Amino acid sequence: RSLNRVHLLGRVGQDPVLRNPVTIFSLATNEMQKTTWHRISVFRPGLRDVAYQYVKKGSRIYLEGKIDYGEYMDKNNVRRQATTIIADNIIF
Amino acid sequence: RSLNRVHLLGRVGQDPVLRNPVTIFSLATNEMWVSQKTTWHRISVFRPGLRDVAYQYVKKGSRIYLEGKIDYGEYMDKNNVRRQATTIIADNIIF
């Protein structure tokens, strides 16, 4: 076995979007300003609708998941879309 | 106040490399379910004691646990802003 775990607690940028559907929204995380923006995806079949329904613009949550390294093309070379795939979400 | 912390435990892919200096190696994480899937991470250490400890010790093939934060490296090409993800690490523990 391996481990690939992430924990994030921050404010959501915008209302979620639904794009094997998938809820996609972003998340800000601060240092002291450094702000780090995360691309969040939820594929899981329950939390997926929960997080669509109830996660909103500017809301503060905690999530756990795993990082997933997407990898796409711009003109035939190999560029990096980095996503955080969430297994669990904790709402305020 | 926020929170960006990550935990990974995996095999190192090649002997590390040094480069405000920084040590840089790569980790593999395997998800199994018999099927397999591997995720390759760009690890980078700053903190000064850890950094030379990793460098002296972390070697191609080692099983290692660590923790750190996510950093989406922003760089540019033909002046379009792109990304290199790195996992910037606060600590490691060896097998």
Swiss-Prot record, chain A:
Top-level taxonomy: Eukaryota, Metazoa, Chordata, Craniata, Vertebrata
Span of the entire protein shown here: 28 to 139 of 148
Reported disease: Optic atrophy 13 with retinal and foveal abnormalities: An autosomal dominant disease characterized by visual impairment in association with bilateral optic atrophy. Atrophy of the optic disk indicates a deficiency in the number of nerve fibers which arise in the retina and converge to form the optic disk, optic nerve, optic chiasm and optic tracts. Many OPA13 patients also exhibit retinal pigmentary defects, attenuated retinal vasculature, macular dystrophy, and foveopathy.
A GO term from the CC aspect: extracellular exosome
GO MF annotation: an example: identical protein binding
Disulfide links within the chain: none
Domain SSB: 3-92
UniProt effect for mutating R60Q: In OPA13; reduced ability to stimulate POLG-dependent DNA synthesis in vitro
Cell compartment(s), UniProt: Mitochondrion; Mitochondrion matrix, Mitochondrion nucleoid
Positions bearing N6-succinyllysine: K75
Positions bearing N6-acetyllysine: K66
Keywords: Acetylation, Disease variant, DNA replication, DNA-binding, Mitochondrion, Mitochondrion nucleoid, Phosphoprotein, Transit peptide
Keyword Phosphoprotein set for record: yes
Main location: mitochondrion
GO biological process: DNA replication; DNA-templated DNA replication; mitochondrial genome maintenance; positive regulation of helicase activity; positive regulation of mitochondrial DNA replication; protein homotetramerization
Protein name as it appears in the record: Single-stranded DNA-binding protein, mitochondrial
Outcome after substituting I85V: Found in a patient with a systemic mitochondrial disorder; uncertain significance; impaired multimerization; reduced ability to stimulate POLG-dependent DNA synthesis in vitro; mtDNA depletion without any detectable energetic defects
Role: Binds preferentially and cooperatively to pyrimidine rich single-stranded DNA (ss-DNA). In vitro, required to maintain the copy number of mitochondrial DNA (mtDNA) and plays a crucial role during mtDNA replication by stimulating the activity of the replisome components POLG and TWNK at the replication fork. Promotes the activity of the gamma complex polymerase POLG, largely by organizing the template DNA and eliminating secondary structures to favor ss-DNA conformations that facilitate POLG activity. In addition it is able to promote the 5'-3' unwinding activity of the mtDNA helicase TWNK.
Organism: Homo sapiens (Human)
Subunit structure: Homotetramer. Interacts with MPG/AAG, through inhibition of its glycosylase activity it potentially prevents formation of DNA breaks in ssDNA, ensuring that base removal primarily occurs in dsDNA. Interacts with POLDIP2. Interacts with PRIMPOL.
Top-level taxon of origin: Eukaryota
Tissue: Expressed in retinal ganglion cells, photoreceptors, pigmented epithelium and fibroblasts (at protein level).
